[PDB]
Design a protein around this ligand. Structure first.
Ligand code: MG
Ligand code: MG
Lengths: 267, 188, 94, 267
């Protein structure tokens, strides 16, 4: 509670395992070169779900490091950023399980009540953003993404002109916002792929990050399964975005593929 | 005010809260044209909706009529969902409410709920060769598309007071194709 | 090159032809793109949109102008300094 | 047969529609700024699957343009490159169908006996390479992919270093080879993503395209569903690739995710 923890290159600021319960309310945890949180390394296997080790950063907690969370990869984890907590890290895992085959518990993270994770991941099993924000800094994988009460994923604007990012998700559900970058006469954009199942009302805000276009060309923003039940709407003022002498609107057709059409702007 | 009902024979063409006629729930067969009074047409072809409007001394809108009747609706928006089966109510899984699509003149579901067939021809032609596709009442040749207006529940950005599709032949039938009646204004 | 009255009709229609094209109320001829296009002043999109007819010819029209001059090219979205309009309506006998 | 066909920017070398049957053997078709082949524009709609309009480029045919095939939407097409024919273009559809919510048939291409399409697509419904090669020139989307008898999908080597390409597929079947680009110093690589279903024995051949890595670092190569039936094997001889003073091998980890692991090369 309102404490400071500084870790050097080799280590981590917090290691929890064997079913621990950590809360960090307020204060700061830095780990410049290493991890902010590490999980496992001293195994104790159990058939029913014990206290699937949970870490909670709340009430204004600041956390910075190369990775925000580093999973060993025997144990299931449960990271939670709440109450305006802010962590810039990465969330990585071991990338080969110790026993090839038969399961491996979930790595679950909840972003809630005004919190803000800013990083990249291809390791999280299930993310739930709820009136909070994930600033996505690089291409990412997530199993099950859920949004609620104005939760957003905010594709971070590249300082590298022209370079787009892709967020792949296995299942989408609920209702949230997705701020996405678009590059006009290069005709490229941040994409969002849902692979098995999509549902709910979502919104897409569009940032003009590549300067205005020579022509009028469409841009794929969202790809979803064939007979999908999910809906998306352009969140910019009036359901349109003006890029130079052009105007764009979100239109989807056929098979949950939500492009962004545009043609000459009203004189 | 409302899109054509299936029971237009007993209700009139324009009634609140009734099943909307489409390719599936096709309108009752006009009694003025050999309809028995409970039988329905086998599809939702232009021919059929045009027949029904005549029976009530009305016609399908032209472009200039449509762009006018539907002004005031929310442009470039659609009902969403998987269906709009009923006049004046929200659609099956509608992502926006019916009254968002209400004209300056109180035309209910003006746009983006169901394409209305029109009374103008042009656009994409059919086979430049005789085709007997007219419910067995003669053959067409180089038959141009019969206009469709407004957009339906599932063309999100495409829909609106000037939305227009000139692809469908008049013999086409789909569940996004209904009709809205118009007629002259007489002052005496 | 020729004075305005040259273009008065039998019915007293002034500048009846050969001055400005008039938009007609009829669709046909050259189609626009075979793909939805949002060129309707922001009131929806149009697929395979046929031209709105224009009648009469214009000052530049040379010997093509006249009472049956008709151009089925311009879509409803087009706009030029020689495209105008003339109103017509029904005749009411009571 | 052995004919030559040139077309201006505003046009196409061939337009076929309404159940047309076109065979091009030998010869040449160019369309420097247009399409080589266009499909549709003259509606004739019948529920029976008549002779779904088909084009075949065989017996060493040459074909070049801004796109190899442009589909007018809402007619089904069957493009076939065989007998060592070579076409470079792009294959595009219209994005929006004319009638939102109705049946559209498939855009099916079949690369066979020694043929070679070089281009990119997000319009092809079902591509089948068989003793042929698709040189993929940019990010792409295909519904059902199917390979056989040394059918390959050669990811083209980028001129821009660091620029990786991604192929997304709905379903994968049969047995083929994938040439892929690797940028070891950056820890980045071409990816192959299968979203619904994967199966069969496939081979990956790695190309070094960003030499001299600081450390040994894993690089994701293939993504497949749940517990997919698909096997992959690294086709570089001895099942390894030596990038500077480092050796990489392919390992499948957890839920069908084939990464390229590697560490310091044996002395
Ligand atoms: Mg007319
Ligand atoms: Mg006409």
């Amino acid at each position: 509670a309102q404490s400071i923890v500084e870790a050097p290159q080799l280590g981590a600021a917090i290691r929890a395992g064997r079913g621990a319960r950590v809360t960090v309310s307020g204060g700061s945890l830095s780990a410049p070169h290493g991890n902010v949180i590490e999980t496992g390394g001293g195994a104790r296997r159990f058939p029913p779900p014990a206290s699937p080790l949970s870490i909670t950063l709340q009430a204004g907690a600041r956390a910075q490091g190369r990775a925000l969370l580093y999973r060993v990869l025997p144990e299931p984890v449960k990271l939670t950023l709440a109450g305006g907590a802010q962590g810039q890290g990465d969330i990585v895992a071991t990338e080969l399980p110790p026993i090839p085959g038969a399961s491996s518990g979930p790595l679950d993270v909840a972003l809630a009540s005004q919190a803000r994770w800013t990083g990249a991941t291809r390791a999280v099993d299930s993310l739930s953003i709820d009136n909070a924000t994930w600033v996505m800094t690089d291409n990412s994988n997530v199993g099950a993404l859920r949004l609620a009460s104005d939760g957003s994923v905010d594709f971070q604007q590249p300082a590298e002109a022209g370079r787009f990012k892709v967020l792949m998700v296995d299942t989408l559900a609920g209702s949230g916002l997705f701020r996405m970058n678009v590059f006009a006469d290069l005709g490229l954009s941040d994409k969002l792929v849902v692979m098995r199942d999509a549902s709910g009302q979502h919104r897409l805000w569009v940032r003009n990050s590549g300067s205005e276009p020579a022509s009028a060309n469409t841009m794929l923003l969202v790809q979803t399964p064939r007979g999908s039940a999910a809906t998306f709407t352009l969140a910019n003022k009036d359901g349109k975005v003006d890029i130079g002498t052009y105007r764009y609107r979100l239109a989807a057709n056929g098979n949950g593929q939500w492009s962004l059409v545009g043609a000459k702007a009203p004189p | 005010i409302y899109l054509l009902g299936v029971n237009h024979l007993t209700d009139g063409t324009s009634k609140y809260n009734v099943t909307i006629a489409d390719g599936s729930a096709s309108p009752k067969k006009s009694t003025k044209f050999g309809g028995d009074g409970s039988a329905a047409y086998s599809d939702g072809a232009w021919y059929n909706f045009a027949e029904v409007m005549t029976h009530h001394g009305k016609r399908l809108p032209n472009y200039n009529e449509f762009q006018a009747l539907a002004f005031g609706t929310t442009e470039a928006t659609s009902s969403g969902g998987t269906d709009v089966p009923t006049t004046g109510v929200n659609g099956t899984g509608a992502t926006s409410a019916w009254n968002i699509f209400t004209s300056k003149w109180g035309v209910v579901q003006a746009s983006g709920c169901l394409w209305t067939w029109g009374n103008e021809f042009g656009g994409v032609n059919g086979a430049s060769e005789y085709t007997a596709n007219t419910g067995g009442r003669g053959s067409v040749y180089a038959q141009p598309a019969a206009a469709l207006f407004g957009g339906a529940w599932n063309g999100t950005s495409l829909s609106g007071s000037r939305a227009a599709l000139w692809y469908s032949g008049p013999s086409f039938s789909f569940a996004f194709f209904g009709a809205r009646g118009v007629c002259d204004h007489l002052i005496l």
